[PDB]
Every structure is written in structure tokens, then in C-alpha cells.
Amino acid sequence: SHHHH
Amino acid sequence: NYTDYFFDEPAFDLHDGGYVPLEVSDAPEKPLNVPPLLKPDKETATDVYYTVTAEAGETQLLPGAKTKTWGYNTSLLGQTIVYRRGQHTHVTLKNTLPELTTFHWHGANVSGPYVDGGCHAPVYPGESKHIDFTLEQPATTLWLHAHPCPSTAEQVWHGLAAMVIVKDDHEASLPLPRNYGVDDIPVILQDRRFHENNQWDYRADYDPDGVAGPTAMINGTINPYFDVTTQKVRLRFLNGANRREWRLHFADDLPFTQIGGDGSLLPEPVKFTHLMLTCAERAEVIVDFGQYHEGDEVTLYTDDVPLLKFRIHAFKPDQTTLPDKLFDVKAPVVDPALPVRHVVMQGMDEGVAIDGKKFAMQRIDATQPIGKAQYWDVTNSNDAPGMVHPFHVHGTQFLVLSRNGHAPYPNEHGFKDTIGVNPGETVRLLVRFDLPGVYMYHCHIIEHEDGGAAAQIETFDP
Amino acid sequence: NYTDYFFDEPAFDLHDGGYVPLEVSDAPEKPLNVPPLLKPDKETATDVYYTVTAEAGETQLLPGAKTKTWGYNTSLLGQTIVYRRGQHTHVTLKNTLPELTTFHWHGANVSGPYVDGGCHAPVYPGESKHIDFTLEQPATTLWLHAHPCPSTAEQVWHGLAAMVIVKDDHEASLPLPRNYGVDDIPVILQDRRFHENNQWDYRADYDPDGVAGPTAMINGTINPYFDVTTQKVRLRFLNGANRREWRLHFADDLPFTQIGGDGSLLPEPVKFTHLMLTCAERAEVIVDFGQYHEGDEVTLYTDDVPLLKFRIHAFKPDQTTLPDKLFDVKAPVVDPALPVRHVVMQGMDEGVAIDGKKFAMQRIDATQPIGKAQYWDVTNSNDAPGMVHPFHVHGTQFLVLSRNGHAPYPNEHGFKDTIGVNPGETVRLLVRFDLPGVYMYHCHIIEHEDGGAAAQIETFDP
Numbered sequence: 001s002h003h004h005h
Numbered sequence: 006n007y008t009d010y011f012f013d014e015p016a017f018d019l020h021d022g023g024y025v026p027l028e029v030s031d032a033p034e035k036p037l038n039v040p041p042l043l044k045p046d047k048e049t050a051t052d053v054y055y056t057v058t059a060e061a062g063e064t065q066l067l068p069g070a071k072t073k074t075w076g077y078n079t080s081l082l083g084q085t086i087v088y089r090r091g092q093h094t095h096v097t098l099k100n101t102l103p104e105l106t107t108f109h110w111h112g113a114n115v116s117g118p119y120v121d122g123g124c125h126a127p128v129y130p131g132e133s134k135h136i137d138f139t140l141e142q143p144a145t146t147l148w149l150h151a152h153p154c155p156s157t158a159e160q161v162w163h164g165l166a167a168m169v170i171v172k173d174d175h176e177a178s179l180p181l182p183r184n185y186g187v188d189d190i191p192v193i194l195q196d197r198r199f200h201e202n203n204q205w206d207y208r209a210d211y212d213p214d215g216v217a218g219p220t221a222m223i224n225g226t227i228n229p230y231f232d233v234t235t236q237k238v239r240l241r242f243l244n245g246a247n248r249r250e251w252r253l254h255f256a257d258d259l260p261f262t263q264i265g266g267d268g269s270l271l272p273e274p275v276k277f278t279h280l281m282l283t284c285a286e287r288a289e290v291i292v293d294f295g296q297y298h299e300g301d302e303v304t305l306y307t308d309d310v311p312l313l314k315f316r317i318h319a320f321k322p323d324q325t326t327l328p329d330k331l332f333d334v335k336a337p338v339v340d341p342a343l344p345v346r347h348v349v350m351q352g353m354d355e356g357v358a359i360d361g362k363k364f365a366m367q368r369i370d371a372t373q374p375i376g377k378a379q380y381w382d383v384t385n386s387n388d389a390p391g392m393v394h395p396f397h398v399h400g401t402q403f404l405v406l407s408r409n410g411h412a413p414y415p416n417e418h419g420f421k422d423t424i425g426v427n428p429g430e431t432v433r434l435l436v437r438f439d440l441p442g443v444y445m446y447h448c449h450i451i452e453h454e455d456g457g458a459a460a461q462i463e464t465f466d467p
Numbered sequence: 468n469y470t471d472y473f474f475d476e477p478a479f480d481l482h483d484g485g486y487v488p489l490e491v492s493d494a495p496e497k498p499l500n501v502p503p504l505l506k507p508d509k510e511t512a513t514d515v516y517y518t519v520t521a522e523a524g525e526t527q528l529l530p531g532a533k534t535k536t537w538g539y540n541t542s543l544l545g546q547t548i549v550y551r552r553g554q555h556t557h558v559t560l561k562n563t564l565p566e567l568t569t570f571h572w573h574g575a576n577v578s579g580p581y582v583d584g585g586c587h588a589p590v591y592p593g594e595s596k597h598i599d600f601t602l603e604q605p606a607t608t609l610w611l612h613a614h615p616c617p618s619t620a621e622q623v624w625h626g627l628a629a630m631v632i633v634k635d636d637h638e639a640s641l642p643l644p645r646n647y648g649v650d651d652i653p654v655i656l657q658d659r660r661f662h663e664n665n666q667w668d669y670r671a672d673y674d675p676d677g678v679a680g681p682t683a684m685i686n687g688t689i690n691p692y693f694d695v696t697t698q699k700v701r702l703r704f705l706n707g708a709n710r711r712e713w714r715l716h717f718a719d720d721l722p723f724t725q726i727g728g729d730g731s732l733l734p735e736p737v738k739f740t741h742l743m744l745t746c747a748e749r750a751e752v753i754v755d756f757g758q759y760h761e762g763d764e765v766t767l768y769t770d771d772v773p774l775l776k777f778r779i780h781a782f783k784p785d786q787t788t789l790p791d792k793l794f795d796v797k798a799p800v801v802d803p804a805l806p807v808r809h810v811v812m813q814g815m816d817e818g819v820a821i822d823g824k825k826f827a828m829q830r831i832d833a834t835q836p837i838g839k840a841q842y843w844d845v846t847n848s849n850d851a852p853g854m855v856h857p858f859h860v861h862g863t864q865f866l867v868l869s870r871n872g873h874a875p876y877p878n879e880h881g882f883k884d885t886i887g888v889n890p891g892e893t894v895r896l897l898v899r900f901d902l903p904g905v906y907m908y909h910c911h912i913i914e915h916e917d918g919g920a921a922a923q924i925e926t927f928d929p
């Protein structure tokens with residue numbers, strides 16, 4: 001569920 | 006809301022105008038290359054003898070043609086070299102390349118400028134040199150890479166880098182994974198651009214602000230997986246890229262514990278979910294796969310891009326626990342007679358400089374007496390927008406005292422040889438040189454080094 | 468059964484195992500490029516001001532894609548730069564290349580090692596330098612080329628060479644063709660190998676014994692012709708090749724007269740049908756087309772290969788005859804307190820060396836007092852089979868006294884800065900340095916220089 005930048 | 010990393014978010018590489026995003030390769034998944042340990046030519050308790058040969062060959066990286074590559078004792082990168090504290094070490098350096106090169110022991114406190122193996126230690130094609138030295142420094146992960154001036158960036162791009170592991174008695178007494186290739190592995194983080202026929206072309210990709218390609222390469226492997234056969238795994242991260250910053254985390258934010266930095270164990274273990282490394286930085290971490298089960302594949306990312314898959318196999322439970330203290334960092338006392346040294350990194354692109362000047366091989370820029378610790382205030386003067394400059398000093402392991410007058414980052418309380426300095430920031434280092442001679446300090450975005458953002462310091466016996 | 472050339476036939480380049488024969492290109496015939504005269508930014512009688520900019524561009528050499536090339540004040544080679552004995556000369560050096568470079572005034576008696584523009588005079592991308600000097604030497608043809616160490620061979624290959632003309636009162640008084648581009652032209656002799664898309668690729672063609680391609684290139688032109696509009700023509704030959712020797716003759720063995728060499732006019736005119744030149748040698752010749760009529764063509768060859776076609780148009784008959792003596796060679800007296808210096812060139816391929824050593828940038832190999840002429844005995848110690856090594860000394864114009872105890876060649880009684888030394892041969896030179904500092908001597912097969920066959924000499928005021 002989590003994406004970076 | 007917040008970045009998950011310690012560095013200043015606006016300065017991240019991904020804001021540069023010419024930023025090259027990583028792209029996932031379609032190349033098939035394959036086992037992570039673990040470079041074999043280099044077999045000594047001869048070893049006793051007191052003496053070890055090695056031959057390190059720079060060579061050209063070919064490596065199957067993508068399907069189709071093999072990539073033309075350089076390596077140490079192998080076609081690409083290098084066999085891992087083990088040194089021991091207090092052991093008299095003998096190395097024959099052999100160059101079988103068509104170009105002159107240099108053998109720089111990054112982070113090794115050996116004499117300069119010859120043994121150190123920077124600009125002033127050329128080895129011509131077909132020739133050999135003999136060096137020897139005894140390391141008196143803590144156990145850590147160092148590395149070897151080419152350092153002709155100019156031409157460092159290009160030679161590293163061809164593939165001339167190798168991990169160096171330094172052992173000591175203290176580290177051997179700690180409860181750490183240490184079975185090399187099984188639960189203790191190098192993770193050499195690089196990128197490349199592949200052109201026609203899977204070849205590299207540094208000059209086509211040249212950028213004075215730093216070369217980066219879209220394909221991640223881990224220990225000279227594309228789309229690597231690692232078979233985990235133990236509950237805990239030690240990873241020796243090395244940023245071996247020309248410019249790129251790595252922002253490392255697992256897909257599901259699996260925690261990991263940093264136990265070592267560039268120059269030593271950290272005094273205490275530091276828990277992380279996300280860790281950023283600038284060029285030449287090393288970080289040693291333990292990952293615990295205890296919540297996973299046979300058949301699971303857990304992936305390490307940089308940002309949104311997958312890098313390295315860990316295929317989980319059956320493993321025996323592991324109850325062991327790290328001590329609260331890993332290592333006693335004994336800070337030297339500053340010599341009170343010595344002033345504060347101010348070093349200023351200036352400019353970007355072609356205009357990069359240190360203290361108003363571009364490097365000159367005949368010119369000494371600074372002096373410092375051996376055995377005497379001095380405060381170095383290092384400033385990245387670039388206004389907004391700017392970049393994080395990794396500042397490296399040859400011939401010392403330094404300590405980090407402060408960042409803009411505040412605490413160092415949590416993983417910066419051990420010995421380091423490279424530190425990322427944010428735009429506008431002044432960092433205070435405690436720097437002592439043990440051995441006399443000539444040493445370089447510079448930015449370790451390698452194109453900046455080649456572009457002349459370097460100076461040299463003469464250390465002397467008083 | 469006699470060769471027509473002065474050098475030792477067995478040692479000619481064409482006997483090497485990796486010899487690359489020239490081949491006539493299929494490219495269209497076209498007018499010989501005559502590089503324009505570089506316009507001073509400002510000139511008075513006492514001072515001249517110039518801007519010399521190293522730049523990267525593209526040149527249409529073959530049909531289709533343009534070749535990526537480097538040049539001075541142009542895409543390839545350079546604009547011809549005119550200096551005058553006695554005139555204070557100001558040059559701004561500007562580097563707009565992506566790599567650092569050096570601005571070497573080959574044969575110009577200027578201070579070293581900075582103005583000289585050798586290994587110790589880097590100019591980084593984007594920076595400028597200011598030099599000034601006053602030439603106090605005879606009129607002659609010199610040249611400018613890149614000289615970073617290493618990387619000279621590669622930068623010359625990219626196209627960083629330009630002709631430099633030095634004027635004086637004595638030469639102006641002589642009845643010589645001097646209308647630049649009409650009856651007085653550079654003939655810059657080089658070779659290249661074209662790859663995919665008409666590009667050059669030094670690294671693919673690299674050979675430590677000397678790089679040579681099959682395609683002759685004359686002033687940056689493939690398959691050139693020149694329209695002759697005068698009875699007599701002055702050709703200023705420069706061997707700007709990495710290795711290749713030129714063995715020059717016209718179709719029908721049409722005579723020509725050499726009037727000049729590297730460093731001065733010849734004392735007396737010398738008549739030739741066949742002239743051999745090694746790397747960096749220059750030779751100024753007068754060709755008389757008096758016997759030909761409009762519509763005739765005369766081809767200049769090297770060996771059996773056509774280089775340059777001279778197309779005879781209508782011409783006024785000539786107002787010239789050469790004096791029996793062109794120039795007074797004022798030979799200095801050897802300082803009798805000084806020993807004979809012996810310099811030995813050794814090895815081939817990767818093993819090239821001078822006096823048992825490869826070059827080191829911070830090492831001084833020799834010393835000599837300024838203002839004092841010394842005998843240098845220079846030996847090529849290559850057994851047969853060997854090669855002719857062109858030996859070059861920075862910062863001086865020397866005199867050739869003898870070859871194996873015999874007379875120098877007919878065209879070697881003037882001042883020279885480069886001399887071809889045959890296998891096993893000792894040449895005796897008379898060498899004086901006017902200016903203090905640091906100078907180099909080396910083989911001018913450019914791969915040999917980059918491979919470390921060079922040493923440095925420090926000159927001092929006593």
C-alpha cells in the first residue's frame with residue numbers, strides 16, 4: 001500500500 | 006508529510022534537471038553474483054601475500070552479446086580481498102589493461118601517495134608494482150577501485166571496483182552473521198546504461214555533474230535474487246555508483262539494523278526501515294527474515310524500483326541478540342594549538358571547485374601534522390537548488406561531530422571516510438592522519454573528482 | 468635496388484607486423500580545405516591578442532552522418548595561427564570540450580612547464596587561461612596540439628592540431644611564395660579509420676606501438692584536389708599522424724626544393740624527388756609547375772598511394788629564384804665543462820622506455836644549465852627488426868651534428884625539434900635551453916609517449 005517519493 | 010531518510014529532501018538527486026530514473030530490466034532473474042574470496046598466494050599468521058591483476062574481458066550481463074568489462078582477478082568488479090589488522094600484507098599489482106591505471110585502497114589507512122594508490126601511483130600496461138603495509142584500524146568494509154587522474158569515472162564504469170573486508174579480534178567476538186556467500190554478502194550498488202550489443206559507452210553517457218544509467222547492477226548482476234538459508238543475513242552495502250544515491254527499503258518496510266559504517270562498527274546498533282547512501286558510503290546491516298516462510302520472495306527497493314529479491318528457504322530459528330554496545334569509539338582530543346580548518350565545496354557541473362581552485366597534481370593545498378587531531382568544517386556552498394556532495398578524505402578515518410551545529414545522523418557515530426554534505430550545510434569532522442605523505446580530499450561524485458573538485462594535503466612529522 | 472629516402476629501408480613502418488596500408492577512399496573528390504588564418508582579437512605593432520578555443524563539433528567528412536570531431540576555433544583541426552618574432556603575444560586559452568586538455572605549442576621556445584602547454588598545464592572544461600610570451604626564434608612552421616598526460620594520442624585523434632606560422636624580417640625579405648591559401652598552403656598529413664556512421668573510435672583502433680588507419684586525411688579532407696594558379700607553390704608539410712611515416716613524391720618524380728625544416732629555414736635549398744617525414748616533422752618545399760600547361764594534373768603520393776591532386780590552371784610566369792644561401796645558422800659553442808649526455812630510447816609496444824624508466828609526472832630525470840649548449844647522443848637501441856623513433860625535445864630548437872658519426876641527412880642542417888632515429892643509431896644533437904623551468908623529451912609516436920616513453924629535464928640559471 002506504500003509508494004516512494 | 007516527511008521523507009523517510011535523513012538527508013534534505015529538496016537536495017535529492019531525483020530533482021536534478023538531467024536526472025535519469027532507474028527502469029526495471031526485462032532480463033531474466035538470476036542468482037546474485039557473490040565475488041569469490043581472493044585466495045592468498047601464500048599466508049602465515051604474520052604475513053599474507055596477494056596478487057591483484059587488473060584485466061579486460063567479457064561478462065554475460067544481458068541476453069545476447071557479452072558486455073566488454075574490466076575487473077580485478079575476474080572479468081568484472083573483483084574478487085573480495087580480506088585483510089587483517091596487524092598482519093603484514095604484501096600485494097603485487099599487475100596491469101594487463103591497454104591503459105594505465107591505479108590501485109586505490111579506499112578507506113585503508115596506508116601511506117600516501119604511492120601505497121594509497123591515487124593519482125601519483127600509475128601502473129602502466131604490462132607492468133607490476135610491489136606494495137606492503139600493515140593495517141592498524143578497526144574491522145570494516147573498504148573497497149578497491151581505479152584512481153588515475155583524470156579517468157577515474159571511466160575506469161570505474163568499465164568495472165574496476167572490488168570489496169575489501171578488514172578483520173580484527175573484536176569484531177570476530179560479536180554475534181554476527183559471517184558465513185561469506187551464505188549469510189554475509191557484499192551488495193555493491195551500481196547503475197549502467199547498455200547500448201547496442203549490450204555494450205557500455207561512458208563517453209556517450211558523459212555528464213559533468215555525474216553519470217547515471219537506468220539499469221541497476223548489483224555485484225555485476227542484472228535482476229538478481231539471493232537464496233536465504235538462514236534467519237538473519239548481513240548485507241555489506243557499498244554505493245559504487247558514479248553519482249546515484251540509493252534510498253533503500255524493503256517493499257513492506259521490513260526493519261533492519263545497521264551495525265557498521267565506512268570505517269568501523271557503529272558504537273550501538275541502529276534500527277532502520279529506510280536508509281540513504283551517497284557515493285562511496287558503506288553500510289553493514291543485519292536483516293531478520295523471521296516473519297517469512299519458505300516460498301516467500303522479499304524484495305529490496307530503491308525508491309519505487311525493485312533491486313534485489315530474497316527467496317526464503319527453510320531456516321533454523323535464531324534467538325541471538327545484538328549487544329546494546331557493539332564497539333567503543335575512542336575519540337582523540339583535538340590539538341588545542343591547531344585552528345579550525347574550513348574546506349568549501351563550490352559550484353556544480355563544470356564549475357565544481359574546492360576553496361576557489363581546481364586540482365593540480367603538482368600543487369599542495371594544505372598541511373597538517375601527523376598524530377594531531379584537527380576540526381575540519383566542511384561546507385557545501387551550493388544554494389537552492391543544490392545536491393548532496395559526498396566528501397571523501399584519503400588516508401584517514403574521521404569522526405562526525407556536528408551538522409549545522411546539530412547532532413550527526415544516527416548512523417554517523419562511528420569512523421567514516423566519506424560524508425554527504427547537504428546544500429548550505431557545514432559539517433564538523435574530527436580528522437587525524439597517522440602517517441606522513443600526501444593525501445587527497447574531494448567530492449566522490451566521481452565526475453566531480455575528474456572535473457577537478459579535489460585538493461591535496463601534505464602531512465608531516467613535527 | 469636503392470630506396471629513394473634517407474632513412475634505413477628495413478626499419479620503414481611498412482615492415483611492422485600490424486602495419487596498416489593506406490587505401491584510396493571511395494569518398495567524392497573535393498577541394499582541399501585550407502584552414503583560415505585566425506583573426507587576432509586585437510593587434511598593434513608591439514602586441515597581438517588571440518583567443519584559442521578548444522571545441523567539440525561535427526564535420527562532413529564522408530557522405531551521410533557528420534563525423535564528431537574536435538578543433539581549435541573550428542570543428543576539426545584549427546585555424547592557422549600567425550606569430551611574429553619580437554612581438555609580445557597574448558593568448559586566452561579556452562576549453563569548451565567535455566574533457567580537460569592542454570595547449571602545447573610544439574617547437575615554440577617558451578617557458579615550461581605552463582606556457583609550454585605540456586602535461587603540467589591542464590585546462591578544465593569551462594575554464595580559461597591567459598598566457599603571454601615573446602618568440603625569439605627564426606621564422607618557421609610550428610604547430611599546436613593537445614598534450615594531457617596521458618590522453619595525447621586520443622585528443623589528437625579527435626582532431627586537436629593546428630598549424631602555427633612564425634614570421635621574421637629575414638624570411639619576409641626572401642623571394643618565396645607567401646600568399647596564404649593561394650600559393651602557400653598547409654599540408655597536414657594524417658590518417659584515420661572510419662567506423663559505423665562515419666565516426667572515429669580511437670579505443671577500438673588502439674595499438675600501443677602506434678595507431679594508424681587506412682584513410683589519409685589532408686587538412687581534414689578526404690580525396691582532396693588543389694587548384695594551382697601560380698607557377699610556384701609553397702607546401703608546408705606537417706606529419707600530424709599518430710605513427711605513420713610519409714614517403715612523399717609526385718607522379719612523375721617532379722622535383723621540388725626544401726627551403727625549411729622544423730625550426731628554421733635550411734641554410735641552403737635542397738632539391739628532392741622523394742621526401743620521408745616521421746611524426747611531428749615539418750618540411751617546407753617549393754614546387755615549380757613551370758613545365759605544365761592549363762588542364763594538366765599532378766598527383767602527390769605517399770608510396771604507391773595518391774594523396775593530393777594538383778590541378779594546373781593558367782598562371783603568370785614566376786618572379787622568383789632562390790639564393791644559394793637561405794639562412795645563416797649560428798651554431799653555439801659547446802660548453803666544454805659539460806659532459807656528453809647519453810639518452811637511450813628502448814623497447815617497443817608496452818615496453819617503451821627512456822633510459823630504463825617510464826615517465827612519472829613529479830619525477831625530474833635530468834638537469835641542464837640555461838644558456839649552455841650540450842652534446843646529446845640519442846640512441847635507438849631497438850635491434851633489427853626495429854622502427855624509426857622520432858625523438859622530440861620541448862623548449863629548444865637543436866642542431867643535428869651527426870648520425871652514427873656520419874653527416875646528418877641533406878635536409879637536417881637547420882634547426883629542428885624532432886629527429887627520426889634509426890634502429891641501432893646514435894644521433895649527436897647540439898642542445899641549448901634559453902629559458903628555465905621543466906621540459907620533456909620523448910618519442911613522438913604518440914602512443915609511445917602515452918605509453919610512458921618520456922622523461923623530464925629541469926633547466927636552471929647558474
Ligand SMILES: [Cu+2]
Pocket residue numbers: 014015020
Ligand atoms: Cu521532491
Ligand SMILES: [Cu+2]
Pocket residue numbers: 051052093
Ligand atoms: Cu613481514
Ligand SMILES: [Cu+2]
Pocket residue numbers: 094095096135136137
Ligand atoms: Cu612484500
Ligand SMILES: [Cu+2]
Pocket residue numbers: 111150285397449
Ligand atoms: Cu574512492
Ligand SMILES: [Cu+2]
Pocket residue numbers: 109110111112397398399
Ligand atoms: Cu579514497
Ligand SMILES: [Cu+2]
Pocket residue numbers: 159670
Ligand atoms: Cu576506455
Ligand SMILES: [Cu+2]
Pocket residue numbers: 002004009254258279
Ligand atoms: Cu517505505
Ligand SMILES: [Cu+2]
Pocket residue numbers: 318319
Ligand atoms: Cu528450498
Ligand SMILES: [Cu+2]
Pocket residue numbers: 345347382
Ligand atoms: Cu569555521
Ligand SMILES: [Cu+2]
Pocket residue numbers: 021214353354391392
Ligand atoms: Cu547538480
Ligand SMILES: [Cu+2]
Pocket residue numbers: 357394395448449450453458
Ligand atoms: Cu560534487
Ligand SMILES: [Cu+2]
Pocket residue numbers: 123152399445447
Ligand atoms: Cu580519491
Ligand SMILES: [Cu+2]
Pocket residue numbers: 476477482
Ligand atoms: Cu623491405
Ligand SMILES: [Cu+2]
Pocket residue numbers: 513514555
Ligand atoms: Cu606587451
Ligand SMILES: [Cu+2]
Pocket residue numbers: 556557558597598599
Ligand atoms: Cu596577456
Ligand SMILES: [Cu+2]
Pocket residue numbers: 571573612747911
Ligand atoms: Cu608535439
